[PDB]
């Protein structure tokens, strides 16, 4: 009766909002990034507690790194600790570096906070204020708080370009997320240019309601999410990315679960026929680009199997009155 | 009747071919390249107006950079600025750069074709020809193209072996690209070889129907795809890799949108107690190991459901004379 | 009758236990290392013949590289060849470079094993021994093994501390492998600590079962598998990782196959006016994170479909008796 139109209306209405006459296959994404800006750093920070002049100008080759694993990385603050050379001495004086009398260093003793290997002596890092000597590559790096205000603050002004290029092999269809003769000159709106592949960090930032400001004093670790909706039917066709910013990292703010986003890169060099090195402690954001979709297009297959659980509503819904 | 017959026939077929009565899972998967070859670089490039003997022997440590993410980067050509440092220079002249007077520089503007921030002044580059002074990595890395042939054109002779490891964790099953015992040496060829993973990268070129050395002048994204169709049911046993290439940059060719694949690369130094750097524009073709498969093994409640969608045809089919 | 009610709590169950009534998303992982550790390299390595005494501590910029790709790398063992620059020089004795005059010499011969090109002249290596003089970056790494215990043995020791997000964007549903306020200071243990993210190397290849010192030795490719299996449905909730290890390396154990993991890392630097290069073959594991999932939450349509399939055996399961 009517019910069985409502049965009918219900399931071929499933079926078309459920998209199952089509088969969904999972893309293939790849990614190219092309970040753009500079920056300049003047700015006053505490070096072995006196004070010191950090100036001059960054650009691409200088705070980034190509794009390795759908992934980029954008450097935003610095700490600096240079003329580093193999050999013994203090610690930095810090709660468990801090020794009375050489009983309380043991010879070979390694510590999680620590960057040497004990002697077993104790000895004067300034003054009479003594630390357990190391050996490492000395002096050692401060235990210090990254620039109050970022070093590389301009890193919000800087632009990243996408180029994403997915392929569906099942179904041999190919595209990109730039189509051809748009209009490159734009930065990405949610609303004014929801296509625009260039992005300000900034805006991205805003987008997820995270200031650019904090996370670039200790890092971050970002994610930009490229989602594919797609429709290879041709009676409705559509097939384009969604931009969404979701932030990645964990917010802990415990000095226990390592917070922010920081690596320690070391450059060699030979100085006074001594092998030295010039470590530099690195915060900025990663920005992780997380390309995810879908795409569909009918099958016979997929129907009829559809149909064959339908007619056992067509059926079942007789025998429910 | 007869129609009963062939519906039983066309279902169980659709069964058969399309797998049904097997569930299927997505694969895992590990890469591991190691990329074989040299090259010799004898040529002639203008720097500054002038000619230069471009020449050096490039090995592997020279050229190439482990696999990050399923994907390796083999430079085939480069443009290199050297001796830079920090300091005041006129910017490259430029339809943007050049200035007739002071009025044309305003102090503190950045643009995102040069690399530095005005001082506000206009100033001689060359001759009676001005462009705003910057401040910047001084001098400034020409405006120019890159080596007219490719300096490290040999790199489609070059070769990578791929290493591909794939599992399926709900049917605990792995496998690897390589089968014990296999004659290692050898191309891969479409016919010839379609299970030697030793690939040149000209024939991947060829392939695509791609010409190497255009590419290589200006750098590019190949793709290396690793089909895996998987059958784990042992009546059918089949599970090995199908090697397809793609070639993933977009052949834009407009200055706007960044064609090719290229990355400035810094190498930092100390000379007459300066920190310098000399700036390299390094060109290449990345590679991009996409490996993607399938896993099937029959599962009797997939087997189930089906049947269940295949009765109401028994019924239905019955119904329909 | 009886079977009726066998049919109906059969099909439920398949249902329940396979969790059909559930749509199912695969996840999106973020994953962020911060690796822990220091090591002390004492030992006596033998260079052109001559016993040297290598020594010198290692830290985190000396060993590892920041996590690219969902993987990290961490050196294990290196030979180091420095000074060396651009020139001619007789290659390394080897099977395929002795020669007994200049007929065994073709000028422009590339060979696989070898980093030069020939200049077509048998010179001397030592003494009265004869190799192809090639063009390359002189002197050529000499042909030997790996130090016999690896000279960052102690990497055993290491910590690997992992983050892992995870994101089902069908369900907007974000979790992340730490939950807040869980103590960290652990160690990942089977048993006793299933959900420490802090893994101890040295465990990880006793899970495997591989032994640390002998991969370490010439490198391998380890595999850290996170397995996401969640529910979103609230009568039962549960979404938390299950870190499992697996190999990854294929242990061939062919010179042809190239062996382990390393490779070849370049050091630039000018000395006396001259392009210099301290070639590092570097030997170490990867870490490959693997994070895969899925995620699951009631659908309607999805249940409908299933139902679907089961009258179909509710009717038939009538017909059989
Ligand atoms: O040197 C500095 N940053 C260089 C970084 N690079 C990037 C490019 N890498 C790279 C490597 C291989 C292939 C491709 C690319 C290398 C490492 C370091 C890691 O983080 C990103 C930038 C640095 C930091 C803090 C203050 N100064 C300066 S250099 C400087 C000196 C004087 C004036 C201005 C800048
Ligand atoms: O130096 C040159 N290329 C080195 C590259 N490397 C690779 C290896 N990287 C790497 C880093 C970390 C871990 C593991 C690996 C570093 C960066 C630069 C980025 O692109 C790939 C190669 C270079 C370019 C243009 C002319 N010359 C020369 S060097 C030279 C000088 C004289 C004679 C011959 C070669
Ligand atoms: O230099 C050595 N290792 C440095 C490695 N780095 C890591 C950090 N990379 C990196 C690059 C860009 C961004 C971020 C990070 C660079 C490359 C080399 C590749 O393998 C990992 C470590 C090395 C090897 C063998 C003996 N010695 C020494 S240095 C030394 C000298 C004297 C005393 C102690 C150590
Ligand atoms: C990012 O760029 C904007 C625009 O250039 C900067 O904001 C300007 O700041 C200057 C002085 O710092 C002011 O005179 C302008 O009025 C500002 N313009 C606007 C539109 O706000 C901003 O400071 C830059 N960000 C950083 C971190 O340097
Ligand atoms: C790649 O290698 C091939 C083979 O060595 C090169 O082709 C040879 O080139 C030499 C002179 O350049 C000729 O004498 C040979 O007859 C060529 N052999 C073949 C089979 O073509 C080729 O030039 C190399 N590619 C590049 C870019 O250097
Ligand atoms: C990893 O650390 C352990 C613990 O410090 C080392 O084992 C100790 O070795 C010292 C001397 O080498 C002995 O005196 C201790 O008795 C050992 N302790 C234990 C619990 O075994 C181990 O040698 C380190 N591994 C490496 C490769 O250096
Ligand atoms: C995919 O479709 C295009 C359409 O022209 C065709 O040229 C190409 O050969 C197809 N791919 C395969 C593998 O058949
Ligand atoms: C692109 O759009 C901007 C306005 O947002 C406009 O100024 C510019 O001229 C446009 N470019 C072209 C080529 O039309
Ligand atoms: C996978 O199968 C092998 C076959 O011998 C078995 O040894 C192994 O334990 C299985 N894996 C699990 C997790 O049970
Ligand atoms: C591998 O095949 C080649 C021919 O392509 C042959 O010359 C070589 O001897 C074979 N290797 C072995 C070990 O049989
Ligand atoms: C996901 O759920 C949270 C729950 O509060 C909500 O705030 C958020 O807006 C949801 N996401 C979207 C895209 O609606
Ligand atoms: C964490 O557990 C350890 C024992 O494994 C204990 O010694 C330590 O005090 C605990 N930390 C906290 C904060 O409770």
Redesign the pocket.
């Known amino acids: 009766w009517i019910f069985h139109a409502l049965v009918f209306s219900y399931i071929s209405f499933a079926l078309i909002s459920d998209k199952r006459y089509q088969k969904k296959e999972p893309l293939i994404s790849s990614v190219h990034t092309k970040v753009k800006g500079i920056a300049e750093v003047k700015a006053e920070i505490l070096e072995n507690g006196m004070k010191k002049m950090v100036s001059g100008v960054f650009d691409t080759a200088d705070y980034t790194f190509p794009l390795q694993g759908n992934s980029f990385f954008v450097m935003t603050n610095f700490i600096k600790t240079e003329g580093q050379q193999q050999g013994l001495c203090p610690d930095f004086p810090t709660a468990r570096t801090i020794c009375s009398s050489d009983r309380g260093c043991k010879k070979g003793r390694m510590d999680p906070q620590s960057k040497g290997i004990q002697t077993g002596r104790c000895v004067v890092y300034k003054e009479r204020l003594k630390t357990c000597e190391v050996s490492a590559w000395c002096p050692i790096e401060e235990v210090k708080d990254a620039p109050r205000p970022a070093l590389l ?5 800087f632009t990243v370009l996408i180029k994403n290029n997915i392929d569906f092999p099942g179904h041999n269809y190919t595209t990109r997320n730039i189509l051809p003769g748009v209009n490159i000159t734009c930065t990405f709106h949610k609303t004014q240019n929801p296509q625009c592949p260039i992005f300000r960090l ?1 805006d991205i930032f805003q987008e997820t309601g995270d200031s650019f ?1 904090d996370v670039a004093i200790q890092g971050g670790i970002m994610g930009i999410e490229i989602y594919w909706d797609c429709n290879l039917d041709g009676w409705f066709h559509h097939c384009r990315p969604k931009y969404s910013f979701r932030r990645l990292d964990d917010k802990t703010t415990s000095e226990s679960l390592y917070p922010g986003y920081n690596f320690r890169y070391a450059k060699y060099y030979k100085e006074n026929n001594v092998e030295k090195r010039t470590l530099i402690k690195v915060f900025g954001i990663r920005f992780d680009i997380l390309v995810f979709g879908t795409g569909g297009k009918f099958n016979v297959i997929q129907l009829a199997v559809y149909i064959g659980s339908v007619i056992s509503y067509f059926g079942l819904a007789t025998v429910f009155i």
Not at 153 to 157: I, K, L, P
């Open positions: 603050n301009s890193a919000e002004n900034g400001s």
